[PDB]
Amino acid sequence: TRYAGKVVVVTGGGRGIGAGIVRAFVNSGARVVICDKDESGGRALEQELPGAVFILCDVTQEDDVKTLVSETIRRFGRLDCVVNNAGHHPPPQRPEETSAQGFRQLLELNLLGTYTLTKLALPYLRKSQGNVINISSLVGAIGQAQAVPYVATKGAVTAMTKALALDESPYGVRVNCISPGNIWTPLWEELAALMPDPRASIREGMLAQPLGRMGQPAEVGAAAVFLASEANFCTGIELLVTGGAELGYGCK
Amino acid sequence: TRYAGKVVVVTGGGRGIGAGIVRAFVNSGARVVICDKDESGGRALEQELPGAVFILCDVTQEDDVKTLVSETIRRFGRLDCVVNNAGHHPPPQRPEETSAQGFRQLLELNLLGTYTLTKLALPYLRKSQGNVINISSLVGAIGQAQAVPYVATKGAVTAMTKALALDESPYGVRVNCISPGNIWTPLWEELAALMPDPRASIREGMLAQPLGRMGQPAEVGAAAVFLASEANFCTGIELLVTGGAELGYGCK
Amino acid sequence: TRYAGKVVVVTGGGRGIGAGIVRAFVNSGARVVICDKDESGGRALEQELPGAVFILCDVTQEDDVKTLVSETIRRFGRLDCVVNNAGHHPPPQRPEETSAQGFRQLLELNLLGTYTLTKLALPYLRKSQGNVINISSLVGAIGQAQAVPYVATKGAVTAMTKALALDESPYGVRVNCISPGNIWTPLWEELAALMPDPRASIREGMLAQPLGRMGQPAEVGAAAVFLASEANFCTGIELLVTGGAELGYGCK
Amino acid sequence: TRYAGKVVVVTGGGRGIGAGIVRAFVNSGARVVICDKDESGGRALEQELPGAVFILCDVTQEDDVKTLVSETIRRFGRLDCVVNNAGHHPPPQRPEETSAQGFRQLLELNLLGTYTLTKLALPYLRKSQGNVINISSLVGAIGQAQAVPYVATKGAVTAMTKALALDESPYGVRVNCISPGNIWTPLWEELAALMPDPRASIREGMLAQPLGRMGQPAEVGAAAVFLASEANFCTGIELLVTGGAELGYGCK
Ligand SMILES: NC(=O)c1ccc[n+]([C@@H]2O[C@H](COP(=O)([O-])OP(=O)(O)OC[C@H]3O[C@@H](n4cnc5c(N)ncnc54)[C@H](O)[C@@H]3O)[C@@H](O)[C@H]2O)c1
Ligand SMILES: NC(=O)c1ccc[n+]([C@@H]2O[C@H](COP(=O)([O-])OP(=O)(O)OC[C@H]3O[C@@H](n4cnc5c(N)ncnc54)[C@H](O)[C@@H]3O)[C@@H](O)[C@H]2O)c1
Ligand SMILES: NC(=O)c1ccc[n+]([C@@H]2O[C@H](COP(=O)([O-])OP(=O)(O)OC[C@H]3O[C@@H](n4cnc5c(N)ncnc54)[C@H](O)[C@@H]3O)[C@@H](O)[C@H]2O)c1
Ligand SMILES: NC(=O)c1ccc[n+]([C@@H]2O[C@H](COP(=O)([O-])OP(=O)(O)OC[C@H]3O[C@@H](n4cnc5c(N)ncnc54)[C@H](O)[C@@H]3O)[C@@H](O)[C@H]2O)c1
Ligand SMILES: OC[C@H]1O[C@@H](O)[C@H](O)[C@@H](O)[C@@H]1O
Ligand SMILES: OC[C@H]1O[C@@H](O)[C@H](O)[C@@H](O)[C@@H]1O
Ligand SMILES: OC[C@H]1O[C@@H](O)[C@H](O)[C@@H](O)[C@@H]1O
Ligand SMILES: OC[C@H]1O[C@@H](O)[C@H](O)[C@@H](O)[C@@H]1O
Ligand SMILES: Oc1c(F)ccc(Cl)c1F
Ligand SMILES: Oc1c(F)ccc(Cl)c1F
Ligand SMILES: Oc1c(F)ccc(Cl)c1F
Ligand SMILES: Oc1c(F)ccc(Cl)c1F
Ligand code: NA
Ligand code: NA
Ligand code: NA
Ligand code: NA
């Protein structure tokens, strides 16, 4: 009952971190709208969790997002929290292998999709004194190799979170982001599968953290519920969920 | 029941932020040992809250701290979380009005007291896979005027938190800190009372945050319970509880 | 003679910060290619400074940028440093007054133009063990009110700087950024002119810094020459040129 | 002639980073007072460099520091820059192997010695519109294993730098710090000699940086001359001289 009576939209909530965030909010008492461009995971999640419903939505399509917000209000009558989790990490790419075209397409998902849903949701979040939670990445803050477009998109998300927090503070709407490090998700597994030695890639990813393991979607989910339900004096913060990967010296 | 069956020590828990942290852990199901050098607030808190007990302890006295840990184990049989909140902010002091003597005494409370209890507690925290929460300050990160010794002590606490997180990660013991901004406490009120216009000082402190208010001990307390009970992939982080004071341009 | 025999390209070098950076490199002994989309300032600068030449180039046009690099090599035979300074700050805009369209156009100048020139220049920078200097902004790090798209673009630039520094480090090519705060430029003056009271806006901007003044293009220029010529162990850093605006509490 | 006619005091200037900073300022045209507790390196440096003189001074002894300032004024008539470089990194120590006693002694050198000279020098720095440069460490910001007291002292130095910058800004006195990463010095070599395999320790230290090498005292020296002579809009900044060690993921 930490977030009972509240309505939450989670983009990319069909699998991975997003699904962990969906489950955490449902466990907190909220009703959750699962937004995803793929039907498979989200539809099954809606059958599994009472209180969660699935709405097909590609956050890069402005009309999809308009319909997502209006359907959320029509079906549930309020909107308290938007979790902008939809995003993608391309396979490793040397800077000379990247293109302005691919960069624009990644900006469209990782940054403008977050911008568009937030914009459409804010009138309702103002009515509810709701809040926005953006899922950025640690590599937005510290960089990463062979990921220039991805890193740039998460740098923008983290900075945009702070700008929006300033604009919305007079209306009592908080805007925060979570920066996960290595979290074991289908995306991580897919990316590891492309490497010459997948098992070696995964063990390298585990040892990137002083804790010696990757994180779980449920741990990102707990951080999100905290920001929504108990962080009333937090706005514009970047909550690190990284297992300490940013600490100390390492083999670079 | 988020932290049921767990045992928490809170230093400086007799009033202010520490008392808010005590109440939050008790509300989470934990048993809490209130450590304070002053009897008045802590003893009343123990009478008020079942599950909380008061132990007189000056964290600058190594034998006081040794007795605090041994009494906690003797009476409760385990130790899961240490919250190093004891600390003091002197009145405003121009750098030429400070002294090496006063600097050393402030280091003794704000930094070495935290170091001493953490050291004595870590053998028991390792047994429990417990965690350490240090209460630092936003001004450790961004500086503050007329507070050179205070700022230095909180810079050390925040850095020490990261060093300790690295050392204790192989043992599964997490070490994190909370950096509050302006929180309305008896200390803030006492400090405002020394100003020529106390009400003007307080309104200036409120407007330092884009949220337009100071924070509450209960909000620091919620952040502490989160770090202890639900932040299992967080170590070495600095959790800002500041109302956004660090964001954007201001009259400096 | 600190940077004698070296060849530097400065985008947006016709006025403002870019012109200050041009002058600083010329004063250091380098030959400088001034890139700008407007002829007026850049052409006059080329007449004024021996060693500086002006090449008309809109960094949002990929063929313009291709021609800029090839003409630089054809005329000067090497390329040692690229300063990505072209950029624009729109007038204040509430988040609900922004558009995805305007956001994309600002990304095209502030981020993709930097990405495009850097990409085309890197083969030559690798030959010279040259370096990249991106002009970002303090508000990328701390946010700003009524500037969501602008803040996001500078957050991306600062993060991209770190990602690129990692990719190019094996080749001895350093990538750094400068984050200016309030610098008195034609852009600042133009923006102040739109305010109801321009003089009040300017005095507010001066007092945003503990130093009590805005910065000068020449001071950004000195920081750029340092990064190019004397910072051989610096890569991926964000050099703040802000007069301390990020320090301490302020009226927010 | 970048800093001609100026007078600089460098503590711990007899070897290592301090000696590199001495040489850089002498090369810039300044007169430099070398302060060190050991006679060997400093006296030889004074014989080698016209314009540099050696004054025996232990920065932990307040009367030594008083005499250092008064002798500097008596012999050279002004004081423009103080570089607080004296400091020590103990051998690796697990947290349970540290002591409050050793912690206090390290605070006395790494933090209070910097505080004491800065305090005694500020009246003269105000007359000259001079500046303060503190040598902190990257591990103050990101932590380090087996170095809890050391990390805490550098966290304090970096924070104190910002507090002092705020206090001294109305007087036109800038206060900045440099945070080096792994720099090859006699201290690094001494520490490596204590390891079971010194050569393995050194190669690990080199690979901690994406640049693949450690830094040089001369590179720290160039950064110091920049801050003193050309960074007139920089105050309270932390200038990283780390070869990118803080960037990206590493084996932790
Ligand atoms: N996995 C990690 O280690 C990690 C670390 C840091 C940040 N992140 C971020 O976390 C978020 C989720 O990552 P993940 O690992 O769970 O990925 P994932 O690929 O496992 O899941 C992402 C989900 O988003 C959906 N999605 C993708 N594009 C969409 C679109 N246009 N509209 C709607 N839904 C869309 C996908 O269908 C999928 O269900 C991303 O923003 C990612 O950048 C991940
Ligand atoms: N109040 C704020 O705005 C603010 C902001 C940032 C950080 N902080 C930090 O929060 C902590 C608590 O601050 P507060 O405002 O609640 O202060 P407070 O003065 O209201 O309460 C501090 C408590 O600690 C106790 N204490 C002091 N010295 C002690 C010692 N030697 N041994 C044991 N207990 C001791 C006091 O008796 C008191 O009960 C401090 O570490 C302070 O630096 C406060
Ligand atoms: N002025 C400040 O206070 C401040 C603070 C932080 C960051 N910045 C950044 O500094 C940079 C320069 O700012 P400024 O104040 O000097 O601005 P300015 O408007 O005075 O000058 C910018 C110059 O870039 C040119 N330019 C614009 N679009 C271009 C394009 N497509 N191709 C080529 N040239 C183009 C303009 O013609 C102009 O000559 C920008 O990146 C800005 O974001 C400025
Ligand atoms: N070497 C590195 O990789 C590194 C990295 C980051 C920060 N640092 C910092 O740089 C500074 C210099 O380090 P280094 O590697 O050159 O060390 P070093 O041991 O080689 O030289 C330090 C010098 O300071 C002197 N000194 C020590 N105690 C003193 C005292 N009480 N009074 C006066 N002089 C005293 C020593 O005699 C010596 O000449 C220190 O503050 C250190 O923490 C070093
Ligand atoms: O596919 C890799 C991991 O992704 C996570 O989202 C799932 O919760 C796990 O069951 C799975 O092991
Ligand atoms: O004294 C100022 C404030 O301090 C806080 O710790 C208390 O919870 C408040 O009741 C009080 O208003
Ligand atoms: O237009 C405002 C300022 O812009 C700067 O780029 C110029 O160097 C100044 O001469 C001018 O005062
Ligand atoms: O002793 C290790 C290194 O220390 C530096 O201060 C010296 O300049 C070098 O000559 C030496 O190789
Ligand atoms: O942002 C990240 C990251 F930091 C590490 C791995 C993946 Cl798959 C990501 F998407
Ligand atoms: O650390 C702080 C702070 F940031 C503001 C006010 C007080 Cl009373 C403190 F102790
Ligand atoms: O980036 C900035 C800033 F921080 C202040 C003012 C202007 Cl005009 C900018 F472009
Ligand atoms: O501060 C540091 C560091 F970051 C690395 C090595 C040494 Cl010897 C130091 F003193
Ligand atoms: Na359901
Ligand atoms: Na009780
Ligand atoms: Na010319
Ligand atoms: Na000499």
PDB file of C-alpha atoms and ligand atoms in Angstrom, chain A residues 249, chain D residues 89 137 139 150 182 187-188 191, ligand 12:
ATOM      1  CA  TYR A 249      40.477   2.369 -10.249  1.00  0.00           C
TER       2      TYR A 249
ATOM      3  CA  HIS D  89      49.723   8.374   0.757  1.00  0.00           C
ATOM      4  CA  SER D 137      43.431  13.448  -5.754  1.00  0.00           C
ATOM      5  CA  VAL D 139      40.402   9.133  -5.329  1.00  0.00           C
ATOM      6  CA  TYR D 150      43.854   8.957   2.623  1.00  0.00           C
ATOM      7  CA  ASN D 182      48.314   7.954 -11.097  1.00  0.00           C
ATOM      8  CA  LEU D 187      56.031   8.085  -3.758  1.00  0.00           C
ATOM      9  CA  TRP D 188      54.459   5.832  -6.400  1.00  0.00           C
ATOM     10  CA  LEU D 191      54.699   2.239  -2.710  1.00  0.00           C
TER      11      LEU D 191
HETATM   12  O1  LIG E  12      46.174  10.049  -4.773  1.00  0.00           O
HETATM   13  C1  LIG E  12      46.879   9.020  -5.301  1.00  0.00           C
HETATM   14  C2  LIG E  12      46.375   8.223  -6.320  1.00  0.00           C
HETATM   15  F1  LIG E  12      45.166   8.550  -6.827  1.00  0.00           F
HETATM   16  C3  LIG E  12      47.075   7.176  -6.871  1.00  0.00           C
HETATM   17  C4  LIG E  12      48.353   6.916  -6.410  1.00  0.00           C
HETATM   18  C5  LIG E  12      48.903   7.702  -5.411  1.00  0.00           C
HETATM   19 CL1  LIG E  12      50.532   7.442  -4.881  1.00  0.00          CL
HETATM   20  C6  LIG E  12      48.164   8.731  -4.861  1.00  0.00           C
HETATM   21  F2  LIG E  12      48.701   9.474  -3.876  1.00  0.00           F
END
